[PDB]
Scaffold this active site. Structure first.
Site, short mmCIF file in Angstrom:
data_model
loop_
_atom_site.label_atom_id
_atom_site.label_comp_id
_atom_site.label_asym_id
_atom_site.label_seq_id
_atom_site.Cartn_x
_atom_site.Cartn_y
_atom_site.Cartn_z
N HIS B 15 0.82 -1.20 0.00
CA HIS B 15 0.00 0.00 0.00
C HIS B 15 0.86 1.25 0.00
O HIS B 15 0.46 2.29 -0.53
CB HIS B 15 -0.94 0.01 1.21
N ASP B 112 -5.92 5.90 2.28
CA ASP B 112 -5.66 4.54 1.80
C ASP B 112 -6.94 3.70 1.74
O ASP B 112 -7.84 3.88 2.55
CB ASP B 112 -4.62 3.85 2.69
N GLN B 321 13.37 -4.02 -7.62
CA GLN B 321 12.65 -4.81 -8.60
C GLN B 321 12.56 -4.09 -9.94
O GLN B 321 12.78 -4.70 -10.98
CB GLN B 321 11.24 -5.14 -8.09
O1 LIG Z 1 12.34 -7.79 -3.13
C1 LIG Z 1 11.50 -6.95 -3.41
C2 LIG Z 1 10.08 -7.20 -3.12
C3 LIG Z 1 9.06 -6.19 -3.46
N1 LIG Z 1 9.44 -4.96 -4.07
C4 LIG Z 1 8.52 -4.06 -4.37
O2 LIG Z 1 7.23 -4.23 -3.47
C5 LIG Z 1 6.33 -3.61 -4.15
C6 LIG Z 1 4.93 -4.10 -3.82
O3 LIG Z 1 4.78 -5.52 -4.01
P1 LIG Z 1 3.39 -6.05 -4.56
O4 LIG Z 1 3.54 -6.46 -5.98
O5 LIG Z 1 2.39 -4.94 -4.48
O6 LIG Z 1 2.86 -7.28 -3.72
P2 LIG Z 1 2.72 -7.31 -2.14
O7 LIG Z 1 2.97 -5.92 -1.59
O8 LIG Z 1 3.79 -8.22 -1.58
O9 LIG Z 1 1.29 -7.91 -1.68
C7 LIG Z 1 0.15 -7.16 -1.48
O10 LIG Z 1 0.39 -5.69 -1.73
C8 LIG Z 1 -0.56 -4.96 -2.55
C9 LIG Z 1 -1.65 -4.40 -1.68
O11 LIG Z 1 -2.69 -3.91 -2.50
C10 LIG Z 1 -1.18 -5.76 -3.71
O12 LIG Z 1 -0.73 -5.18 -4.94
C11 LIG Z 1 -0.80 -7.19 -3.70
O13 LIG Z 1 -1.67 -7.95 -4.63
C12 LIG Z 1 -0.93 -7.75 -2.36
O14 LIG Z 1 -0.74 -9.18 -2.43
C13 LIG Z 1 6.71 -3.83 -5.71
O15 LIG Z 1 6.57 -2.59 -6.43
C14 LIG Z 1 7.99 -4.24 -5.77
O16 LIG Z 1 8.77 -3.39 -6.73
C15 LIG Z 1 10.85 -4.70 -4.36
O17 LIG Z 1 11.17 -3.68 -4.87
N2 LIG Z 1 11.89 -5.72 -4.02
#
Ligand SMILES: O=c1ccn([C@@H]2O[C@H](COP(=O)(O)OP(=O)(O)O[C@H]3O[C@H](CO)[C@@H](O)[C@H](O)[C@H]3O)[C@@H](O)[C@H]2O)c(=O)[nH]1
Ligand SMILES: O=c1ccn([C@@H]2O[C@H](COP(=O)(O)OP(=O)(O)O[C@H]3O[C@H](CO)[C@@H](O)[C@H](O)[C@H]3O)[C@@H](O)[C@H]2O)c(=O)[nH]1
Lengths: 456, 439
Positions: B15, B112, B321
């Protein structure tokens, strides 16, 4: 309300750098910045700087100024950077449509010092508050204001002119020896433009300077109330102007080499962006660096414009010599991130030409300086540095353009720079004062805040 | 004039990323931005990220939100991030003086999607227009708004507005488990989305058909708050894995990451390693097991750890990433299906193999699959629920890498995404209109 400020640039990195950094500061102080650029840039470095600044700051609008077709035959010098200044100045009456097009309506026009005289009336027509952006030291600004009156005072700059002083209000007098060599050449394009601009600094609502009060005694408030008494526009110390984040690439090969050196053991050597040493001087400096016995990082230019420096260092010094020097220290014929180098811990000292941007960079990063003036303002700025206690400037060496210095003496003086403890003690203090100036409640912070508050 | 916008954050990197990136965006569109933060953050990433934003953007002000003391006795969930939302939500009355305090006068407040129900009234009291920052897909947002009426009313279709139906199979599992903290809070939020003035979604029209402009007129007819697409939200301006990536051929590397807050079972880590070795492709693998002190050597073994290193890059750490995805060597992405990572893949034009593990992913995967950018194995189901062996993994990865239509779609959609946020683009226009109304 977020005040709208348009910045009118010219050619040259020495003028461009503080303009872009000032744009960054303004934006980071809740102001709208629009930059008025012109192309093609004389040097690549300028274009790259503009592109990077714009990529980091998408909220800065760029308006291209289309210059009138130019006839170089009319011009006195073969110097590209000056030529561009005149090219802009001869198309001044076309800034009016440009400026009229802009939205939201402009609060202020910051105009480069090189183009003041031609462009300050354009700001008057539109009731636009105009401020000059001054890229050099304050003493130099005073000299530039006082010079036209001085040339009006004399019959001719003939042999009657010897090394005697020029009176400057609120400053220590300046010897002819320290005066920019081109000044004596009246009717030089630069000199003409300088008389005009120096005459026209008074017309603006204010003069912006990259400095802090602590850097130059406590004379500036007095000078300012005197100016207010005489009806002259104020000096606004808005410095030190901080480098942008894009100016830092922590993966540079020179930086990587610097990382493996003992701290305070490296000597940085550079002479600006628009000037190249003579071949003899390049060779002798090469000898001197080895003779110093110190680690060094050396930035070499064989031509003023970076685009044109196609020649390899293998062409000048040649073959085994360059290898030999390479064994002792880092040598490069390429653009380097200088502020990043100055911040490094391995760097103990700086051999500079006395350019105000690099000088201020060393002041900000607390690097002791060995000043080697070549031309222009640099003998004056040098003096400033020496008075600060952050550096030393060798008077026996005179002007670099007109005198040659051999390798041995260079070595000895570099050793002097490396051995000097008072310079290093002063470096820290002046560094901290430099920080205090731009901290909230500092001199520069107060001035800047006042400026924006006028706009409002 | 410089309109002042407030961003109300909540715990969770998923978020927080769109939050900070939206701060950067709004700043870049001539707005003043104030962020409301709470400490201590659950994970280090959030803190460090806020630090980096505030460092890169001195023109952004940070206002620390203090919360009522909370008891984790209920605590319907044991999830820290979810619990934090309860901590902030329960202290909603503390928000009024805080938001009244900031000067110059706020022109709008962004809150949010997790805390909408509780914090949208605060806006109404101050005549403060409020927008909800939704992190997930348009389909998922629709579902969230549609669900409460559905609970009020097996693996069949759930009603959705302006969209193809959703199989309950695709529905996030926690929806079924009512009186879970997440489910309850969400039921509260969905019925309160309508109270907000607009919905900020990280997306562009070309990503999901030409229906997006129409759903807005349709919604306008029902008196619903418009869906405002401001995406793609570009990463902000704030090396060893990249250095490894530079020594690699173009489009020859598979990228594997499953988000910030999820960890595979040890068995599945073993089997995925097996599939990576059996894939025959170079890879960059990001491993998760802040409380992760134990080395990958422990879980995988030491003799086992050496074999995988020969054929690929294995790391157990936070990675950039986006920096990895923009790289040329990366030919494909194995993702969990989160919206941020998926969006970054859309932006960098990386073909993806989706492996939905929980949450919104099952919807997202569909969208992905629907876009033609990526492929998802419906057979694998939920990664949390099911285990997959090495052979299937390797084979499916080969399918992904061998896929050429995906590359074409990736390029074209990269172009669409780029054009979206350029001047005249669909995405920038909605922003211009939003800021223009602030005014
Ligand atoms: O090693 C890493 C791991 C994550 N990210 C970043 O973390 C961010 C967010 O990750 P995300 O793809 O959103 O998944 P999560 O945050 O782990 O999981 C929840 O976070 C969000 C809440 O709405 C949703 O998009 C997801 O579906 C939900 O599962 C990404 O932009 C990634 O670039 C990194 O840069 N390096
Ligand atoms: O390899 C390089 C060469 C130059 N610079 C930068 O170029 C900038 C400007 O150099 P400067 O110190 O201003 O000298 P010059 O630009 O070469 O020369 C003129 O430029 C300015 C015009 O006002 C004056 O300060 C100088 O006295 C004048 O000689 C500095 O910030 C340097 O950091 C680099 O970063 N890397």
């Amino acid at each position: 309300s977020c005040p709208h400020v348009a910045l009118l640039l010219s050619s040259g990195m020495g003028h461009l750098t503080p303009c872009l950094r000032f744009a960054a500061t303004l934006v980071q102080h809740h102001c709208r910045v629009t930059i008025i650029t012109n192309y093609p840039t004389v040097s690549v470095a300028e274009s790259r700087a503009i592109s990077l600044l714009l990529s980091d700051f998408p909220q800065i609008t760029e308006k291209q100024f289309h210059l009138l077709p130019f006839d170089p035959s009319t011009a006195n010098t073969t110097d590209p950077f000056f030529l561009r200044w005149e090219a802009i100045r001869r198309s001044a009456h076309l800034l009016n449509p440009l400026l009229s097009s802009i939205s939201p309506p402009l609060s202020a026009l910051v105009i480069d010092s090189s183009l003041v005289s031609s462009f300050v009336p354009v700001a008057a027509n539109l009731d636009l508050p105009s401020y000059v952006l001054f890229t050099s030291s304050t003493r130099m600004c005073s000299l530039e204001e006082t010079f036209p009156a001085f040339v009006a005072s004399k019959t001719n700059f003939d042999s009657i002119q010897l090394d005697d002083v020029i009176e400057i209000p609120g400053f220590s007098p300046v010897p002819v020896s320290s005066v920019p060599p081109v000044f004596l050449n009246l009717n030089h394009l630069f000199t003409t433009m300088l008389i005009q601009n120096g005459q026209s600094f008074r017309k603006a609502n204010g003069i912006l300077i990259n400095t802090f009060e602590a850097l130059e005694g406590g004379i500036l408030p007095g000078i300012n109330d005197k100016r207010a008494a005489d009806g002259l526009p104020p000096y606004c110390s808005v410095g030190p102007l901080l480098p942008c984040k894009f100016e830092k690439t922590e993966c540079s090969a020179p930086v990587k080499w610097l990382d493996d050196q003992p701290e305070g053991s490296v000597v940085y050597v550079s002479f600006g962006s628009r000037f190249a040493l003579s071949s003899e001087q390049i060779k002798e400096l090469g000898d001197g660096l080895i003779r110093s016995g110190c680690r060094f990082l050396w930035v070499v230019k064989c031509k003023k414009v970076d685009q044109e420096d196609e020649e390899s260092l293998d062409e000048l010094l040649g073959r085994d010599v360059l290898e030999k020097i390479k064994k002792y220290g880092f040598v490069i014929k390429n653009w380097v991130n200088q502020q990043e180098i100055l911040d490094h811990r391995a760097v103990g000292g700086f051999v500079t030409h006395g350019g105000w941007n690099s000088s201020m960079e060393a002041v900000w990063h607390g690097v002791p300086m060995l000043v080697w003036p070549q031309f222009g303002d640099q003998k004056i700025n040098a003096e400033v540095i020496e008075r600060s206690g952050l550096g030393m400037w060798v008077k026996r060496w005179g002007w670099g353009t007109q005198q040659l210095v051999k390798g041995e003496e260079i070595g000895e003086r570099i050793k002097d720079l490396m051995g000097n403890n008072p310079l290093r003690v002063r470096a820290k203090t002046l560094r901290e004062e430099a920080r205090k100036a731009i901290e909230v409640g500092g001199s520069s912070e107060k001035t800047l805040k006042e400026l924006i508050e006028n706009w409002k």
